[PDB]
Amino acid sequence: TMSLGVENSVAYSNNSIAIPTNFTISVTTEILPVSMTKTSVDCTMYICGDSTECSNLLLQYGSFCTQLNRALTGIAVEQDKNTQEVFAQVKQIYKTPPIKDFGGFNFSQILPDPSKPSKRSFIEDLLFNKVTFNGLTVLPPLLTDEMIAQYTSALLAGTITSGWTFGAGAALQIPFAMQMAYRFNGIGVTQNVLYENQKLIANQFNSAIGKIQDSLSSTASALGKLQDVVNQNAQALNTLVKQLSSNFGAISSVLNDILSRLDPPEAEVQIDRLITGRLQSLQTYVTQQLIRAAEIRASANLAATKMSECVLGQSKRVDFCGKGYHLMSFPQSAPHGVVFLHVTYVPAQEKNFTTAPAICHDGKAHFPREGVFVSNGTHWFVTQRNFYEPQIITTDNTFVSGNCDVVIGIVNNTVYDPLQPELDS
Amino acid sequence: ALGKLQDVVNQNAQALNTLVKQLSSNFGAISSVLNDILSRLDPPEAEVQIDRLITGRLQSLQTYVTQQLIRAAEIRASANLAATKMSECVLGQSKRVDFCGKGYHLMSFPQSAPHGVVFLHVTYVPAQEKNFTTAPAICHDGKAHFPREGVFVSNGTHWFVTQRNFYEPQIITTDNTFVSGNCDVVIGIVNNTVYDP
Amino acid sequence: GTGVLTESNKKFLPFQQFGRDIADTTDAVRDPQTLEILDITPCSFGGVSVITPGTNTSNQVAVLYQGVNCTEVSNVFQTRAGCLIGAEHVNNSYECDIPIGAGICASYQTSQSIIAYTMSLGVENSVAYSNNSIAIPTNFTISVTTEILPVSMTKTSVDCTMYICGD
Numbered sequence: 001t002m003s004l005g006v007e008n009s010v011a012y013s014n015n016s017i018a019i020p021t022n023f024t025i026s027v028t029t030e031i032l033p034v035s036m037t038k039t040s041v042d043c044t045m046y047i048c049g050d051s052t053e054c055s056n057l058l059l060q061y062g063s064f065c066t067q068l069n070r071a072l073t074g075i076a077v078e079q080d081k082n083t084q085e086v087f088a089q090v091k092q093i094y095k096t097p098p099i100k101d102f103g104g105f106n107f108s109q110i111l112p113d114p115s116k117p118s119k120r121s122f123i124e125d126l127l128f129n130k131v132t133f134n135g136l137t138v139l140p141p142l143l144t145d146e147m148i149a150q151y152t153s154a155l156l157a158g159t160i161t162s163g164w165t166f167g168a169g170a171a172l173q174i175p176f177a178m179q180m181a182y183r184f185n186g187i188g189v190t191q192n193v194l195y196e197n198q199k200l201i202a203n204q205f206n207s208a209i210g211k212i213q214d215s216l217s218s219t220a221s222a223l224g225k226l227q228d229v230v231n232q233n234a235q236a237l238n239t240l241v242k243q244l245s246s247n248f249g250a251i252s253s254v255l256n257d258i259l260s261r262l263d264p265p266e267a268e269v270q271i272d273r274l275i276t277g278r279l280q281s282l283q284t285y286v287t288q289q290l291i292r293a294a295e296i297r298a299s300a301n302l303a304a305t306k307m308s309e310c311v312l313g314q315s316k317r318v319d320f321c322g323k324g325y326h327l328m329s330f331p332q333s334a335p336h337g338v339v340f341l342h343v344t345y346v347p348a349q350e351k352n353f354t355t356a357p358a359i360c361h362d363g364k365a366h367f368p369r370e371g372v373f374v375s376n377g378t379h380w381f382v383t384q385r386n387f388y389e390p391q392i393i394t395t396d397n398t399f400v401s402g403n404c405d406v407v408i409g410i411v412n413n414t415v416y417d418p419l420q421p422e423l424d425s
Numbered sequence: 426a427l428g429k430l431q432d433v434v435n436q437n438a439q440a441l442n443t444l445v446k447q448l449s450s451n452f453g454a455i456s457s458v459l460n461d462i463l464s465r466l467d468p469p470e471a472e473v474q475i476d477r478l479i480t481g482r483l484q485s486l487q488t489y490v491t492q493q494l495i496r497a498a499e500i501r502a503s504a505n506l507a508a509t510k511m512s513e514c515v516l517g518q519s520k521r522v523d524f525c526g527k528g529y530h531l532m533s534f535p536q537s538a539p540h541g542v543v544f545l546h547v548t549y550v551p552a553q554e555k556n557f558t559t560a561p562a563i564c565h566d567g568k569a570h571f572p573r574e575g576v577f578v579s580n581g582t583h584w585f586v587t588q589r590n591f592y593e594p595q596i597i598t599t600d601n602t603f604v605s606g607n608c609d610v611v612i613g614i615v616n617n618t619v620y621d622p
Numbered sequence: 623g624t625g626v627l628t629e630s631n632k633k634f635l636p637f638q639q640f641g642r643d644i645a646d647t648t649d650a651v652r653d654p655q656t657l658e659i660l661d662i663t664p665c666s667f668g669g670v671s672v673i674t675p676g677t678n679t680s681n682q683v684a685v686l687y688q689g690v691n692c693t694e695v696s697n698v699f700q701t702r703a704g705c706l707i708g709a710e711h712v713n714n715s716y717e718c719d720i721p722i723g724a725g726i727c728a729s730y731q732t733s734q735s736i737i738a739y740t741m742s743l744g745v746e747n748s749v750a751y752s753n754n755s756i757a758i759p760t761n762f763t764i765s766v767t768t769e770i771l772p773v774s775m776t777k778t779s780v781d782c783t784m785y786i787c788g789d
C-alpha cells in the first residue's frame with residue numbers, strides 16, 4: 001500500500017509562531033512542450049501511390065482527402081504559432097554587456113556560448129543532447145533552433161540587465177543586486193536582507209545552477225515530457241505506415257500486385273477494399289493528430305503565460321513559477337519545448353516564538369504596521385513575517401486602535417517613543 | 426484585426442459547405458441524387474445503389490460532428506480565457522504580466538463583437554527614461570540607510586530618493602529611509618547626509 | 623513498379639530474391655539476369671506552394687517545391703524547405719512577411735519583385751548595464767490596446783435522416 005507522505009503534526013497553539021531565521025535560494029526546472037513535428041500526408045499518394053486506377057476510384061469519395069490535408073496543414077501552422085507565442089515575447093534583441101558585474105551572480109551556464117556554431121547556452125546544449133517516403137513528409141519549423149536560442153538569449157539578457165521593465169516598456173537598466181532587492185520586496189522580505197546576505201544569496205544561486213547542470217548532465221530522462229511527445233508522434237506515424245500492409249479483405253495489400261495480376265473489372269474490387277481501409281486509417285490518424293495538437297496548443301499557451309508572468313515579471317500566484325516564493329525565472333530553449341529555471345525563496349531555519357496579536361502600553365492597543373510581535377522568552381520585539389529580524393517595539397513600528405478590552409490575546413508591554421529622549425534632553 | 430473572429434466564422438461555413446457538397450458524391454452509386462435512383466430502378470436494384478450513398482453520407486456526417494466537437498473544445502478554451510479576462514481585467518486590476526495587455530494594466534473595457542468579445546486594455550507605459558547614478562544604501566553616521574519605498578538616485582552631484590516607476594526626486598530624510606546595520610556589509614554603499622526633520 | 627533503381631550494398635543471401643519495407647513494399651530486388659541487388663526508391667515528390675502577394679497587389683508569384691532539391695524540377699534558390707523559384711534571395715533581413723520555413727520568409731519589395739530572405743527577430747539593443755547606473759522614466763504614456771477573443775460558434779442541428787435519406 002503506497003505511502004502518501006511523512007506524517008507531521010504542526011506544533012500549533014494560540015500563542016506560538018514559527019519564524020524562519022534563514023533561507024535557501026532554490027532553482028527548479030519546469031519543462032513544457034511548445035510544438036510538435038509538422039507532418040503532412042498526401043492523401044492520394046498514401047492511399048493510391050502512383051496509381052491512376054486507384055485514384056479514379058478514390059475520386060468517388062468526394063473531398064475526404066482535401067479536408068484531411070486541410071486539417072494537417074492547420075496543425076502544422078499552429079505549431080509555428082505556438083512557438084512564436086512562447087518565444088517571440090521580446091520586442092528587441094537584448095544582449096548582455098561584456099562586463100558581468102552582476103553582484104556576484106553567475107549566469108555563464110545559461111548565457112550563450114559564442115564559441116559554438118549555434119550560440120546556445122551550456123544548459124541548452126545539454127537539453128538538446130538529452131532529447132533524441134509513402135506520401136509522408138516533414139515540414140521544417142519556421143523558426144530555426146538558432147532563432148529560438150536567440151529569443152531565449154534576448155529574454156535572459158533583458159531580465160538580467162533590466163528586471164521586469166523590458167516586458168512593460170523600454171528596458172530600463174538597473175544593477176542586478178538592486179533588482180534582487182526589488183524581488184525580495186516583492187516576496188515580503190525587507191531588502192536589507194538581500195544586501196546584508198548578498199554573497200550568501202549569490203553563492204546559493206550559483207550552487208543551485210550548478211546542481212541543475214549536474215542533474216541534466218547525469219539523469220538522461222530529465223526531459224521526459226518532450227520525449228513523450230516525440231514518441232507519440234513516432235508511434236502514430238509508424239502505425240499509419242504499417243496500416244499499408246493490411247489487406248482489408250483484398251487478395252494483396254500491394255496495389256501493384258493487384259494491378260499486375262488482375263484485369264480492371266476484378267482489380268477494382270480489391271482496390272476498393274484497399275481504399276476503404278487506408279482511408280479509415282488516414283482518418284483515424286488525422287483525428288488523433290487533431291486531439292494531440294489541441295493538447296500541445298494548451299501546453300504552449302501555458303508556456304507563453306509562464307514566460308510572460310515568470311520571466312517578464314514576478315508572480316504572486318502560488319506554485320505557478322515553481323515551489324516557493326517566486327524570485328525570477330530564466331528560459332532555456334529545448335527541442336520542441338521550453339525549460340524554465342525558477343529561482344524561488346524558501347525559508348530555511350525556523351524557530352519557535354511566543355506571539356501576541358497586539359500590545360498594551362497606556363490603555364491603547366498597538367498593532368504592527370508591518371510584521372508580527374514575537375517574544376524570545378522575556379522581551380518582546382516586532383519582526384518581519386518571513387525573516388527573523390527582531391526590533392524594539394516603538395511607535396514607528398506599530399499603530400494604535402482603541403483600547404485593550406477587545407483584543408483576544410493582547411499582552412502588556414512598553415512601546416518605546418523615539419521623540420521622548422530628544423524632548424527630555 | 427478582427428481576423429480571429431472571421432476565421433472562426435469561415436471555419437464553420439467551410440465545414441457546412443463541405444457537408445453539403447458531400448451530398449453530390451456518388452460513393453460508388455450510379456447517381457448522387459436519391460430520387461433519380463428511386464425513379465429509375467426497382468427496389469431490389471435501388472437498395473444496392475442506396476446503400477453506397479448511405480455509407481458515404483453517414484461517414485461524412487460523422488466527420489462533420491467530430492470536427493465540430495474538436496472546434497467546440499477550442500472555442501470553449503477561448504471562451505474560458507475570455508471569462509477569466511473579463512473577471513481579472515474588467516472587474517479588477519491584474520498584476521499578471523501581459524494578461525490584460527502590454528504594459529502596467531490600469532483597466533479594461535469590454536465590447537461585444539459577433540460571436541466574440543473585444544477588450545480595450547488601458548495600460549501605463551513608462552515613456553522618457555533618464556540615466557542616474559544609484560546606490561543600494563547610504564551611510565550617514567556609520568549606519569546603512571535603505572529606501573522605504575523607492576531607489577536612491579544621483580543627478581551627478583546630489584543624492585535623492587525617488588519612486589521607482591516615475592522620476593520624482595526628493596531629499597533623503599529619516600522618513601524616506603530606514604536603518605539596518607553598519608556600513609561594512611552593503612556592497613556599493615555611498616556616503617551622503619540623511620536629513621532629520 | 624515505378625521508381626529509381628540504384629546499386630545497393632545490401633547483403634542478400636543466395637535464396638533471397640527481394641526485400642520488403644515496413645509498409646510491405648518491395649524496397650530492393652535481385653536482377654534476374656545479372657544477379658545484383660538493386661535498391662528501389664520513390665522517384666521524387668512533394669507539395670507545391672505558391673507564394674503570392676495579394677492579387678490586388680500583383681499577379682507575380684513564386685513557387686516552392688517542398689522538400690525537393692533544385693535539380694529535380696529565372697531565380698532558383700535552395701532552401702531547407704525545398705526549392706524556391708521566382709524569388710530573389712537577398713542578403714538583407716526583414717520581418718517575416720510570408721513564411722517559407724527554416725527561417726526563410728518571402729515578401730514583395732522593390733521594378734518590384736518577390737524576394738526571399740532570412741527573417742530578422744528584431745533590432746539589436748545592448749542595455750547600458752553597470753553596477754551603479756539606473757534608468758528611470760521621467761514621463762509616461764497611456765496605451766489602449768485591443769484584444770479580440772472568440773466566445774462562441776454557430777449552433778447547428780443536423781437532421782440525420784433528412785441529410786442521408788431526405789424524404
Ligand SMILES: *[C@@H]1O[C@H](CO)[C@@H](O[C@@H]2O[C@H](CO)[C@@H](O)[C@H](O)[C@H]2NC(C)=O)[C@H](O)[C@H]1NC(C)=O
Nearest residue numbers: 021022023024025199200201203204207348349
Ligand atoms: C544560512 O544558511 C547558509 C547555508 O545555506 C549558511 O551558510 C553556511 O555557513 C556555514 C558556517 O558558517 C558554512 O560552513 C557554509 O559554507 C555556508 N554555506 C554557504 C552556501 O555559504 C548560513 O550560515 C546560515 N545562516 C544562519 C544565520 O543560520
Ligand SMILES: *[C@@H]1O[C@H](CO)[C@@H](O[C@@H]2O[C@H](CO)[C@@H](O)[C@H](O)[C@H]2NC(C)=O)[C@H](O)[C@H]1NC(C)=O
Nearest residue numbers: 100101104105106107108109122206209210213
Ligand atoms: C561561472 O561558473 C563557471 C562554471 O560554473 C566558471 O567557469 C569555470 O572557471 C574556472 C576558473 O575560472 C575553471 O577552472 C572551470 O573550468 C570553469 N568551468 C567552466 C564550465 O567554464 C566561471 O568562471 C564563473 N564565472 C565567474 C565570474 O566566476
Ligand SMILES: *[C@@H]1O[C@H](CO)[C@@H](O[C@@H]2O[C@H](CO)[C@@H](O)[C@H](O)[C@H]2NC(C)=O)[C@H](O)[C@H]1NC(C)=O
Nearest residue numbers: 353374375376377378379380381390391392393
Ligand atoms: C531576549 O532578548 C533580550 C534582548 O536581546 C536579551 O537581553 C539581553 O541579553 C544579552 C545577552 O548577552 C545582554 O547582553 C543584553 O544586555 C540584554 N539586554 C536587555 C535589555 O536585557 C534576553 O536575554 C533574551 N532572552 C532570552 C531568553 O534569550
Ligand SMILES: *[C@@H]1O[C@H](CO)[C@@H](O[C@@H]2O[C@H](CO)[C@@H](O)[C@H](O)[C@H]2NC(C)=O)[C@H](O)[C@H]1NC(C)=O
Nearest residue numbers: 359360361362363364404405409410411412413
Ligand atoms: C495588563 O495591565 C493592566 C493594567 O496595567 C492590567 O489591568 C489591571 O488588572 C488588575 C487585576 O484585575 C486590576 O486590579 C487593575 O485595576 C487593572 N489595571 C487597570 C489600569 O485597569 C491587566 O491585568 C494586565 N494584564 C495581564 C495579563 O497581566
Ligand SMILES: *[C@@H]1O[C@H](CO)[C@@H](O[C@@H]2O[C@H](CO)[C@@H](O)[C@H](O)[C@H]2NC(C)=O)[C@H](O)[C@H]1NC(C)=O
Nearest residue numbers: 557558578579580581582583584585594595596
Ligand atoms: C542636481 O540637483 C541639485 C538640486 O536640484 C542641483 O542643485 C541646485 O541646482 C540649481 C540649478 O538651477 C541651483 O539653482 C540650486 O541652488 C542648486 N541647489 C543646491 C542645494 O545646490 C544640482 O545642480 C544638480 N546637478 C546636476 C549635475 O544636475
Ligand SMILES: *[C@@H]1O[C@H](CO)[C@@H](O[C@@H]2O[C@H](CO)[C@@H](O)[C@H](O)[C@H]2NC(C)=O)[C@H](O)[C@H]1NC(C)=O
Nearest residue numbers: 563564565566567568608609613614615616617
Ligand atoms: C565614507 O566615510 C567614511 C568615514 O567618513 C570613510 O571611511 C574612512 O576611510 C578613510 C580612508 O579609507 C580612513 O582613513 C578612515 O579611517 C575611515 N573612517 C571611518 C570612520 O571608517 C569612507 O571611506 C567613506 N566612503 C567613501 C566611498 O568615500
Ligand SMILES: *[C@@H]1O[C@H](CO)[C@@H](O)[C@H](O)[C@H]1NC(C)=O
Nearest residue numbers: 011016018019349350351352
Ligand atoms: C516548537 O515546539 C514544538 C513543541 O512540541 C516542537 O515540536 C517544534 O519542533 C518546535 N519548533 C521549532 C521550529 O523548533
Ligand SMILES: *[C@@H]1O[C@H](CO)[C@@H](O)[C@H](O)[C@H]1NC(C)=O
Nearest residue numbers: 013014015016407408409410
Ligand atoms: C490560549 O490557550 C491556553 C491553553 O491552555 C489558554 O489557557 C489561554 O486562555 C488561551 N488564550 C486565550 C487568549 O484564549
Ligand SMILES: *[C@@H]1O[C@H](CO)[C@@H](O)[C@H](O)[C@H]1NC(C)=O
Nearest residue numbers: 553554555556749750755757
Ligand atoms: C544612458 O547611458 C547609455 C550609455 O551608452 C546611453 O547609450 C544612453 O543613451 C543613456 N540614456 C539616455 C536616456 O540618454
Ligand SMILES: *[C@@H]1O[C@H](CO)[C@@H](O)[C@H](O)[C@H]1NC(C)=O
Nearest residue numbers: 099101612613614752753754
Ligand atoms: C563596479 O564595477 C567597476 C568596474 O569598472 C568596479 O571598479 C567597481 O568596484 C564596481 N563597484 C563595486 C561596488 O564593486
Ligand SMILES: *[C@@H]1O[C@H](CO)[C@@H](O)[C@H](O)[C@H]1NC(C)=O
Nearest residue numbers: 675676677678679680681730
Ligand atoms: C488594394 O489594397 C490597397 C491597400 O492595400 C487598397 O487601398 C485598394 O483599395 C485595394 N484594391 C482593391 C481593388 O480593393
Ligand SMILES: *[C@@H]1O[C@H](CO)[C@@H](O)[C@H](O)[C@H]1NC(C)=O
Nearest residue numbers: 690691692693700701702704
Ligand atoms: C542537391 O544535390 C546536389 C548534388 O546532387 C547536392 O550537392 C546538394 O547538397 C543537394 N541539396 C541539398 C540541400 O543538400
Ligand SMILES: *[C@@H]1O[C@H](CO)[C@@H](O)[C@H](O)[C@H]1NC(C)=O
Nearest residue numbers: 699710711712713714738739
Ligand atoms: C551575399 O553576400 C555574399 C558575400 O559574403 C555574396 O557571396 C552573395 O552572393 C550575396 N548574396 C546575394 C543574393 O547577392
